[PDB]
Amino acid sequence: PTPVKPNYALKFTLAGHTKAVSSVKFSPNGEWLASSSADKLIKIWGAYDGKFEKTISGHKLGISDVAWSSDSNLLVSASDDKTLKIWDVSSGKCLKTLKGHSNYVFCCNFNPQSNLIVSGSFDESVRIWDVKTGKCLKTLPAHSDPVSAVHFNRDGSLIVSSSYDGLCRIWDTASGQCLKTLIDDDNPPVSFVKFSPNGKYILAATLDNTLKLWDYSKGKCLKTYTGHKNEKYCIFANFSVTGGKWIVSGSEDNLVYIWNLQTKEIVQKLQGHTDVVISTACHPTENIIASAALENDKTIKLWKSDC
Amino acid sequence: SSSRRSS
């Protein structure tokens, strides 16, 4: 049963957004895909049949990122309007507007407990917010250039952030202190970071066509994934764990790349988008990928593999 | 419209 390669095949193309898509994310309960776009809208789609479910509106400018709560009932979105918004998915209503960043909000996530939201912004700060009250609990002077990604680890006790300043930092959620600064070589911009599913590693993209897997604690690079194009955009990357253990990323050559996590060999390339694939997401229980593309494409594609 | 990520 150990796989050798996936066989992702296109099942659905989801059109509706009227500007570039920025981020796609599967709900933790597997039922839904949420997408955000430069068109200022969130759209919710059925994860299994591509069925359009609803549009969620209210931001005054484009959205760069969206993230789900652990129970699949809330979304948080990060917008160029300098705010985040917390949304009730069932109703589509804005429950809270998280005000405090002084420039575009670029990235966001809930902690696993989903009592906190973390955000990163072009204002070069990382902010930690109380879900219940909408209060900003902490502002971290995390970076000296825009923050490209923020992510909680599996127990919520750590946050990893990345920035165009070239750093990846690991923060103690409770205290706000930097536990560790991952710095490497001439330090190109770090355009994306997230924790591995088990919390021991950090997957980081740099704007030199490189993904790297790092043991944060040991400060050592374990794996490097190359062969794609990423020199401009903050492209999401994923750990695929439902079948074969893959790394997934979009690319500026309009393809989805899939690598063997262990061997670093490319195991599949998905063709079909007609612009930069800015975002990919991996379904939490099924071998399903979502991909989304920029202005000349504006579609979301759903792909299925047997492994 | 625009988003910083899609620009």
Residue numbers in the entry:
A (entry chain A): 1 to 307
B (entry chain B): 1 to 7
Copy the relevant paper text.
PTENα/β, two variants of PTEN, play a key role in promoting tumor growth by interacting with WDR5 through their N-terminal extensions (NTEs). WDR5 is a highly conserved protein with a seven-bladed β-propeller fold. It is an essential subunit of the SET1/MLL methyltransferase complexes, which regulate gene expression by catalyzing methylation at histone H3K4 sites. WDR5 performs its role by presenting H3K4 for methylation, through the recognition of the guanidyl group of H3R2 by utilizing its central channel of the β-propeller structure located at the top face.
In this study, we determined the first crystal structure of PTENα-NTE in complex with WDR5, which reveals that PTENα utilizes a unique binding motif of a sequence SSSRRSS found in the NTE domain of PTENα/β to specifically bind to the WIN site of WDR5. The complex structure revealed that WDR5 exhibits the typical seven-bladed β-propeller structure, while PTENα-NTE adopts a 310-helical conformation fitting into the central WIN site pocket of WDR5. Based on the electron density, the residues 115 to 121 of PTENα-NTE could be distinctly traced and form numerous intramolecular hydrogen bonds to compact its conformation. The interaction between PTENα-NTE and WDR5 involves a network of hydrogen bonds, van der Waals contacts, hydrophobic packing, and cation-π interactions, which are observed in other WDR5 complexes involving the accommodation of the WIN motif ligands within the WIN site. Specifically, the key R119 (P0) residue of PTENα-NTE extends into the pocket 1 of WDR5, interacting with F133 and F263 side chains through cation-π interaction, as well as making several direct or water-mediated hydrogen bonds with the main chains of S91, F133, S175, and C261 to further stabilize the interaction. While the PTENα-R118 (P-1) residue is embraced by pocket 2 via hydrophobic packing with Y131 and F149 residues of WDR5. The S115–S117 (P-4 to -2) residues of PTENα-NTE bind to pocket 3 and form several main-chain and side-chain hydrogen bonds with A65, G89, and D107 residues of WDR5. Among these mutants, mutating arginine to lysine, which has a similar size and charge to arginine, resulted in weak binding to WDR522–334 too. Further careful structural analysis revealed that an intramolecular hydrogen bond between the side-chain guanidyl group and the main-chain carbonyl group of R118 allows the side chain of R118 to orient closer to the main chain, eliminating spatial hindrance of its insertion into the P2 pocket. Moreover, even a single PTENα-NTE1–173-R119A mutant was sufficient to abolish its binding to WDR522–334, indicating that the R119 of PTENα is critical for the interaction between PTENα/β-NTE and WDR5.
